[PDB]
Amino acid sequence: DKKQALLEAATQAIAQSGIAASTAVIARNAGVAEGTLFRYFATKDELINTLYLHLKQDLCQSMIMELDRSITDAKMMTRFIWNSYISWGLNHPARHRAIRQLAVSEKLTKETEQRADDMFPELRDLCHRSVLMVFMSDEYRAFGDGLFLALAETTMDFAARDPARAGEYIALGFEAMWRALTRE
Amino acid sequence: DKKQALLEAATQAIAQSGIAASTAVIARNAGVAEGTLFRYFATKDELINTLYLHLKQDLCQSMIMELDRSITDAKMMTRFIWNSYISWGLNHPARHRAIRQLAVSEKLTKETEQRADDMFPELRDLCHRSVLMVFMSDEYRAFGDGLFLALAETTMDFAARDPARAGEYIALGFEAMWRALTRE
Ligand SMILES: CCNc1cc2oc3c/c(=[NH+]\CC)c(C)cc-3c(-c3ccccc3C(=O)OCC)c2cc1C
Numbered sequence: 001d002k003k004q005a006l007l008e009a010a011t012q013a014i015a016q017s018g019i020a021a022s023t024a025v026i027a028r029n030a031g032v033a034e035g036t037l038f039r040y041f042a043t044k045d046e047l048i049n050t051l052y053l054h055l056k057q058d059l060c061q062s063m064i065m066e067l068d069r070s071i072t073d074a075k076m077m078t079r080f081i082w083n084s085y086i087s088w089g090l091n092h093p094a095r096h097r098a099i100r101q102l103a104v105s106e107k108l109t110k111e112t113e114q115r116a117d118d119m120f121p122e123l124r125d126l127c128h129r130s131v132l133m134v135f136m137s138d139e140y141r142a143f144g145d146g147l148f149l150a151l152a153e154t155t156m157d158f159a160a161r162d163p164a165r166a167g168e169y170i171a172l173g174f175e176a177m178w179r180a181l182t183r184e
Numbered sequence: 185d186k187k188q189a190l191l192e193a194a195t196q197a198i199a200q201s202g203i204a205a206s207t208a209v210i211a212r213n214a215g216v217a218e219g220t221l222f223r224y225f226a227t228k229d230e231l232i233n234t235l236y237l238h239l240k241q242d243l244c245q246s247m248i249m250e251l252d253r254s255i256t257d258a259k260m261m262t263r264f265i266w267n268s269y270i271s272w273g274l275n276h277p278a279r280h281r282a283i284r285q286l287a288v289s290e291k292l293t294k295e296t297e298q299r300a301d302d303m304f305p306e307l308r309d310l311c312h313r314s315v316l317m318v319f320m321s322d323e324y325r326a327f328g329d330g331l332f333l334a335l336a337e338t339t340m341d342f343a344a345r346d347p348a349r350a351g352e353y354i355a356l357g358f359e360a361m362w363r364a365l366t367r368e
């Protein structure tokens with residue numbers, strides 16, 4: 001009756017005031033004290049590896065409930081999953097604007113990845129089969145992830161401000177990143 | 185001497201808070217009164233247009249200065265241009281953050297936008313020949329510009345954090361931008 005208020009506080013804080021959020025305001029929302037948070041989340045990073053897993057879970061649980069488990073085409077499957085990502089993102093700006101710092105902050109662990117890699121078996125093998133091998137290496141994977149998110153968030157941004165073309169931005173955005181990240 | 189101060193301040197604030205940045209914080213950081221800022225620039229939107237041009241001219245001066253005539257190959261010529269642009273962004277990180285948020289802000293006038301296209305007449309032609317027809321159009325230009333800027337921004341951010349591999353991020357990002365925006 002408070003943990004998801006200490007994550008319903010962080011999301012709304014990381015969002016507005018960047019990875020350096022003021023734990024003071026944080027308390028004023030979940031209604032707790034400093035050590036309280038630290039009795040759920042040991043350190044500030046654990047908070048950032050857990051809040052990321054929290055916000056990731058939701059994003060995936062969202063992306064799975066729209067998976068038409070029947071279609072074959074790797075690109076078509078990637079196209080349908082891109083729709084979900086944009087949807088969740090438009091539905092949950094603050095959430096998305098918080099998962100944004102997290103995936104590009106480095107305060108993340110390598111097990112946090114396998115949590116965010118396995119947590120959706122379908123996209124993981126799909127990427128292995130579609131993404132340039134260079135964006136699958138240890139050295140340039142984060143870069144590849146960075147480009148994908150920057151393209152998704154740009155697509156989110158335009159969709160939200162011009163709702164009548166939204167569909168066209170989604171399709172245009174998807175095709176752009178597909179050429180950028182997959183095999184020719 | 186105050187106008188330049190206002191510009192320099194507006195750059196630093198927009199980089200941090202986008203176009204929502206306060207006109208009071210801007211004046212204050214430039215060591216002038218908020219009333220004064222508004223005698224130089226009657227609206228916030230007028231400030232937004234001038235700083236855009238200020239920044240664009242600065243960015244294009246760098247590109248022109250570093251352009252090699254000897255370059256006869258089209259793809260190679262846009263690579264060299266890309267390096268300069270990234271470099272300009274590595275050198276001037278707030279200038280680029282401000283430039284990107286201004287560029288995508290829907291408050292730019294038609295003349296600003298026209299006068300911008302026409303600072304690098306030759307690169308401007310270059311873009312018309314290379315770039316996907318759809319990203320040059322009336323409806324979707326602004327999206328293209330956004331996609332482009334997202335890619336160079338992510339390139340720039342990875343190169344600055346992990347400079348050991350700066351050259352590779354820059355090359356990888358160029359190739360990603362090329363497949364995303366240019367025609368076959
Ligand atoms: C919070 C959301 N976080 C992420 C969401 C992502 O969604 C992705 C969707 C994709 N299509 C569906 C729209 C493709 C092709 C790659 C994606 C990547 C991705 C990009 C570059 C390299 C690897 C991956 C990647 O996921 O590697 C898995 C083996 C990705 C990465 C992150 C961090």
Ligand SMILES: CCNc1cc2oc3c/c(=[NH+]\CC)c(C)cc-3c(-c3ccccc3C(=O)OCC)c2cc1C
Pocket residue numbers: 240243262265266269283284287301308311312314315319320325328329330332365
């Ligand atoms: C502050 C910087 N402002 C801009 C700088 C830009 O630099 C660009 C460099 C390029 N090559 C070198 C790396 C290419 C190919 C396109 C570029 C575009 C561009 C991208 C998409 C659609 C049109 C254009 C464009 O410039 O259209 C002109 C008609 C571009 C756009 C803006 C706003």
